[PDB]
Amino acid sequence: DPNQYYKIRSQAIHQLKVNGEDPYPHKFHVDISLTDFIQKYSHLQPGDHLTDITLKVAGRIHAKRASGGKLIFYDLRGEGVKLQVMANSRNYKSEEEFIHINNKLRRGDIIGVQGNPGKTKKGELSIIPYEITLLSPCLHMLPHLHFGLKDKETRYRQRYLDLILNDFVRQKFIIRSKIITYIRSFLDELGFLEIETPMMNIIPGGAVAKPFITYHNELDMNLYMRIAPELYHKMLVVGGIDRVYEIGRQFRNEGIDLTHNPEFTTCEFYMAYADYHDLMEITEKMVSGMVKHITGSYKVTYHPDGPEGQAYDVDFTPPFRRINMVEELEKALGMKLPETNLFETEETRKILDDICVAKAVECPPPRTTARLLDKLVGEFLEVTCINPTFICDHPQIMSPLAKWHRSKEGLTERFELFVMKKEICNAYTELNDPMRQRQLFEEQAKAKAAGDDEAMFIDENFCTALEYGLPPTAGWGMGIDRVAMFLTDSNNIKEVLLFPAMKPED
Amino acid sequence: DPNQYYKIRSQAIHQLKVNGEDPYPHKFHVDISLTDFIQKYSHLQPGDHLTDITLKVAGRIHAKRASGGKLIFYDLRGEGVKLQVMANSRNYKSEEEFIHINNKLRRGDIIGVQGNPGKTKKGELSIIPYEITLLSPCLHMLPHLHFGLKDKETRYRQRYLDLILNDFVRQKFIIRSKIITYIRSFLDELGFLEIETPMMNIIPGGAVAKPFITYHNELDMNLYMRIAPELYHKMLVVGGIDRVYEIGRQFRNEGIDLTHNPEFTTCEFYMAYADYHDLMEITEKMVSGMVKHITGSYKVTYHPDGPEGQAYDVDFTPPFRRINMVEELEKALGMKLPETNLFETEETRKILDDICVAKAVECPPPRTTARLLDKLVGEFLEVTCINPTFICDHPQIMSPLAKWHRSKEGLTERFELFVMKKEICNAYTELNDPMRQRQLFEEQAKAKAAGDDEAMFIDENFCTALEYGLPPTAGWGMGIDRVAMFLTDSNNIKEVLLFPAMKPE
RNA sequence: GCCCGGAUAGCUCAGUCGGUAGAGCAUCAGACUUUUAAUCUGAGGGUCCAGGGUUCAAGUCCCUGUUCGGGCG
Ligand SMILES: Nc1ncnc2c1ncn2[C@@H]1O[C@H](COP(=O)(O)O)[C@@H](O)[C@H]1O
Ligand SMILES: Nc1ncnc2c1ncn2[C@@H]1O[C@H](COP(=O)(O)O)[C@@H](O)[C@H]1O
Ligand SMILES: N[C@@H](CCCC[NH3+])C(=O)O
Ligand SMILES: N[C@@H](CCCC[NH3+])C(=O)O
Ligand code: NA
């Protein structure tokens, strides 16, 4: 019964509390963890009893078998590993205490065992208890579901239940933490300095992404949540710290879907006296080392549409394949499109749209050249990016805050890393020209951010900082969630998030 | 004058750009870092000139001086280091580009020099330049003062200028980063797991504060920003992860002063099958190891107000002082305050009132015994906690989420680490009882509806999580900003914050 | 808003030609000093999605609907 069981258990616990039987002791001394116990006392043979050694462990019961009136088998489960407890009356303190403690213990209870190691006749590492102490009773029902919980609605809304019933989520979160730690260690070894930029920006920014508007009553003014720490990192680089990095949280006021969250974690770093070609090797080394360290090898098997779908085997050998966008795109399209310098020309946009219509592709109602190309590169180039692949310089239309090409015309010095036909690493070459940056900010604000409103989306403080002299520097960004999904074989962003945002019920 | 200088420099840069030459080169092949350069070539005898290799360094000019018309001395500052360059016509590429680049360069510009290491006979390490390349001109005029900019407004609003002129700011930020790194490493080697709890909640909860309300567009709902990542950690512990930790940002809708900020960073961990007395040693080892590893010794000199005032000396010797709150309060007062058990409602209120009137402690909100006794313990106990000191066994009605004392009654199982008369970290013994927890949450909700503003609402998810069974756990929380303030001899939070949130113009 | 098929113990489903609701899972009680998804025995558990007509007798016919899966606006 869903309701009657809770009421009965609550009444029993209240009765225990009434007659001087506390079910919530303040302290229990866990001498040894379950993992250490299993590692140490696994050398025992079947049917042994190490009566000399007595240790204290604690854990949550996951099963209760009644082989008789005086023999009860519990299954403690902690640290992701199980351990059987064989409660026998003859080895307990007393028969009365044995039958008293066994009555009050059920599945899911948090208990503390104090006993001697050994094994049964069949052979299993078990601790024969001398005195079982209840630590935290479980009032609610714990279902005994084989193969784990499968309803993908209480797994995300009740994460503790998912951790209790399912065991792979702990491995997923451990892998995510290990990824974060590896990134921190690598960037610290390279000499970077970890920083913490403000999350409450006065100016929202000329970005398309909707900001989370917040009101400050003491200063009676509107604060906008952080979208990217880019401007503050570049300000610090102007200040003198040539290498900065930050693995922080960015908030976006967009919808919630399979692979999108209102808040997410991104690792962003900026290094001075470098460029995208300099960061290509760094990204290669970091990604290959992370794949080799988290897993056991460079090979990773991913299921983009669940286990029942197609399994893709990617190889993370350090020599990633590098393809330049325009030379590869023209080949993939099958025809050579007009030169890059004709980006602004309407004729190039019309002919490119003719190509898209000829190849039967779909484009957003805005028919700008940026949309057409981003669609062309996303459905003829990244499709062949099953293995990790570097996409080179992109036209100046898409990336505003990237310097022009060293030799080519109208090409931003930037690169992207595509794995599993998805974008994980983006790296630009910072624009240190104050006049060009000012013009770009003004035009970006006037275009969409301030199309029919006040032109305040420009950051005068950042332009003033750039006026003081920014060294030739290069940035790099990483979406930690995407890498976590790729390394944990997860096709949902909610599988790698501890408490993902969900639509409220009722 | 600064406007005229900006106009002239902007015109000069436009003239530079129009006639082919590019004042913003795309990439400079920096070969060797400035600090490495100094460390490697400090062995040079004054007067040597290694005219056999060429190294390319980069930096920012901060002073120029022409010793005639052929020799020009610059001094680059990079990673907080000094490299004096003596450009001369003889070793340059040729005279014409030499005079051209000397006319083009000014003070504050960011340049890159390719040359040969050496040292003048005076004894100053230098790099003889073969070709000086200008990387980023400085349009504005850098102030020339031999002490660095001192106006607090200019220092905080323009942090890049502070880093450019002042030198201790970089050291302060490095110390803060090392604090965070040491905490992370210690907690990781203890076996903890780093987690990322949501910063947006449907309802407020976690600690007494005023939340930042935000509106969600797609889903018509108000999200309250994170105040403390406390409930989610306990839900995770219920899930099965015994040890968790998180160093993260918390947002508070208070005012802005020299100590408090709208946003700050704190480190919070939770350990299962432990208690506050178990954390009393862990946090002591934390603090002692941090101070030893960062400062270099166990003794710190801290100025409570200004570098010209009294300079207190705080010793972080690992055997800290553990003081009982009630016992020490009685010792300071002498008179025996009636026992915590009775709580003597409407009796001890008068008692504390006579103490505040006689002992002369100001009582702005005289309501409730909580405010009054907090006032007494502030004016009589934490004033002498120069060295780090644990203050344990606080009254129950102080803490709404600390388990009751096992031996005593009416006392909560908690301690606070007071260093330099300020709390840095505190620990709690978690209340795993679901019925008590629901009762206390109901009291908090009643206070929030009428009686309090910082109280939380009823979080039914956490109530269900506690109903599912929470082990006996202990929580610990430290304010990173105050530790950074103490370890960098800073009396203002804005010093340890990269971009402190000042009031607008 | 048009149309198709279901609505059964705490959960998943048989229910047959209408001869009164059962099987499994779950809970509880009992037996079983060596089990491992513990093994049996027993009990409670819905009052047939709601209202009706029909039938000797209606979950097991028909008529109005609500809900669900939806095929469609
Ligand atoms: N709403 C969102 N939810 C999750 N991840 C996001 C969201 N918006 C952006 N990202 C991630 O942000 C990273 C950088 O994206 P971009 O700013 O477009 O370069 C990528 O890894 C994206 O997946
Ligand atoms: N508005 C604020 N700005 C900065 N620090 C604060 C603010 N409010 C509280 N704190 C400090 O942050 C910490 C919060 O409590 P705890 O994390 O338990 O130490 C304490 O050190 C507080 O003094
Ligand atoms: N902010 C960028 C980093 C690239 C360099 C910025 N110019 C990102 O989100 O990845
Ligand atoms: N942030 C709390 C943790 C304990 C949670 C409430 N019992 C502290 O450091 O005191
Ligand atoms: Na049965």
Residue numbers in the entry:
A (entry chain A): 72 to 577
B (entry chain B): 72 to 576
What does the publication say?
Amino acids (aa) required for protein synthesis are delivered to the ribosome by aminoacylated or “charged” tRNAs, activated forms of tRNAs wherein the 3′-end is conjugated with a cognate aa by specialized enzymes called aminoacyl-tRNA synthetases (AARS). In most organisms, LysRS belongs to the class IIb subfamily of AARS and is evolutionarily and structurally related to aspartyl-tRNA synthetase (AspRS) and asparaginyl-tRNA synthetase (AsnRS). In contrast to its bacterial counterpart, h-LysRS has a 70 aa N-terminal domain (NTD) that facilitates tRNA binding, but the structural basis of its role in aminoacylation remains unresolved. Herein, using a series of high-resolution cryo-electron microscopy (cryo-EM) structures, we provide the mechanistic basis for recognition and aminoacylation of fully modified cellular tRNALys3 by human lysyl-tRNA synthetase (h-LysRS).
To gain a mechanistic understanding of the aminoacylation pathway for tRNALys3, we carried out cryo-EM studies of the h-LysRS–tRNALys3 complex in the presence of L-lysine and either a nonhydrolyzable ATP analog, α,β-methylene-adenosine 5′-triphosphate (AMPCPP), or AMP to mimic the pre- and post-hydrolysis states of LysRS–tRNALys3 complex, respectively. The tRNALys3 used in these studies was produced by in vitro transcription (IVT), and therefore, lacked any RNA modifications. The AMP dataset yielded three distinct reconstructions: apo-LysRS, LysRS–tRNALys3 complex in the “undocked” state, and h-LysRS–tRNALys3 complex in the “docked” state. In the presence of AMP, no discernable density attributable to magnesium ions was observed in the h-LysRS active site. For an identical experimental setup, except for the presence of AIMP2, the LysRS–tRNALys3 complex exhibited an equilibrium between the “docked” (55%) and the “undocked” (45%) states. For unmodified tRNALys3, the h-LysRS linker region (208–220) adopts a significantly different conformation wherein H217 stacks against the A37 base, but H215 and F218 do not participate in tRNALys3 binding. In unmodified tRNALys3, U20 and U47 stack against the double-stranded helical core of tRNALys3, whereas in cellular tRNALys3 these bases are modified to D20 and D47, which are nonplanar and assume an unstacked conformation. The tRNALys3 modifications are essential for ordering the h-LysRS NTD, which remains disordered in the presence of unmodified IVT tRNALys3. In contrast, under identical experimental conditions in the presence of unmodified tRNALys3, almost half of the LysRS was found in the apo-state (no tRNALys3 bound).
